[PDB]
């Protein structure tokens, strides 16, 4: 089975969250430009708005969110989860772990992909060296000939 | 207007650069005229003497060989090169004048370009 869905439909999600639709997190690190850094900063950067700016009631200020004000409050509250391995749950710790999990969920093929890439780049570089030698050997007859043409001007 | 290197510094520099390039590859400016290009150059080359046309072919072959080998003419023959010593422009002008006259009064083209 797949992961459960908290809401039956998008309209139900919007009604629950006051008109805001919490986007699917499967490809959130690839859907957003600079996805990993963006998600980590957005989760951890819940700061105070500058002077003169007033966010409309019901919203929370986030500098890294396009627009300034985001619908989710700060959920990565310090001491919200109890890790099963013995790691202190600080906001930065939870941010890094969640971004790692989301980045895996958005790209589960990274390890195999990188291994294949390294092997094939190396092997194809060797092939390129051999192909250059082959070309220089085939053309060596022409590129070193001496032709007498009976002309000067 | 008519801008020649005697009355134009920019034309002098242009001619100097062209002379340098042609001397590097050792081929006259008229050798760049492709017979397949115009078909008037083809006729003009058909009317020229065999010694001249053979010299043109030899110079072109030498230039192509130098181009393949990625080298230039040695400085001796480079100083012995004579670009812009034309051999074809007068004949080409005669051919084009004859074609213009024939077209102007009646006449069918003596030669035509295939499609394409």
């Amino acid at each position: 089975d797949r992961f459960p869905q908290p809401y039956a439909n998008e309209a139900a999600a919007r009604f629950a969250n006051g008109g805001a639709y919490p986007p699917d997190l499967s490809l959130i690190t690839k859907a957003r430009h600079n996805g990993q850094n963006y998600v980590f900063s957005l989760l951890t950067g819940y700061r105070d708005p500058p002077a003169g700016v007033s966010i409309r009631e019901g919203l929370h200020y986030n500098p890294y969110f396009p627009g300034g004000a985001i619908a989710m409050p700060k959920m990565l509250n310090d001491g919200a989860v109890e890790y099963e391995d013995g790691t202190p749950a600080t906001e930065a710790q939870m941010g890094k772990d969640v971004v790692s999990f989301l980045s895996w969920a958005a790209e589960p093929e990274m390890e195999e992909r990188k291994l294949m890439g390294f092997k094939w780049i190396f092997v194809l570089s060797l092939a390129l060296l051999q192909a250059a030698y082959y070309r220089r050997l085939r053309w060596s007859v022409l590129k070193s000939r001496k032709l007498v043409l009976d002309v000067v001007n | 207007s008519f801008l020649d290197p005697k009355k134009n510094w920019l034309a002098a520099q242009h001619m100097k650069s062209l002379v340098k390039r042609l001397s590097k590859y050792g081929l006259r400016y008229d050798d760049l005229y492709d017979p397949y290009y115009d078909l008037d150059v083809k006729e003009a080359l058909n009317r020229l003497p065999k010694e001249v046309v053979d010299a043109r072919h030899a110079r072109l072959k030498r230039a192509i060989d130098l181009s393949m080998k990625h080298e230039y003419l040695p400085e001796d023959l480079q100083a012995m090169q004579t670009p812009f010593r034309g051999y074809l422009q007068d004949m080409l002008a005669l051919v084009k004048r004859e074609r213009a006259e024939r077209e102007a009064l009646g006449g069918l083209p003596l030669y035509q370009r295939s499609i394409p």
């Binding site: - | 003497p49 010694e51 004579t82």
Partner: peptide
């Protein structure tokens, strides 16, 4: 250095 048109039978032609 450049030969005159007197030499080079193709130049003469």
């Amino acid at each position: 250095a450049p030969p005159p048109p007197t030499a080079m039978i193709y130049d003469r032609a």
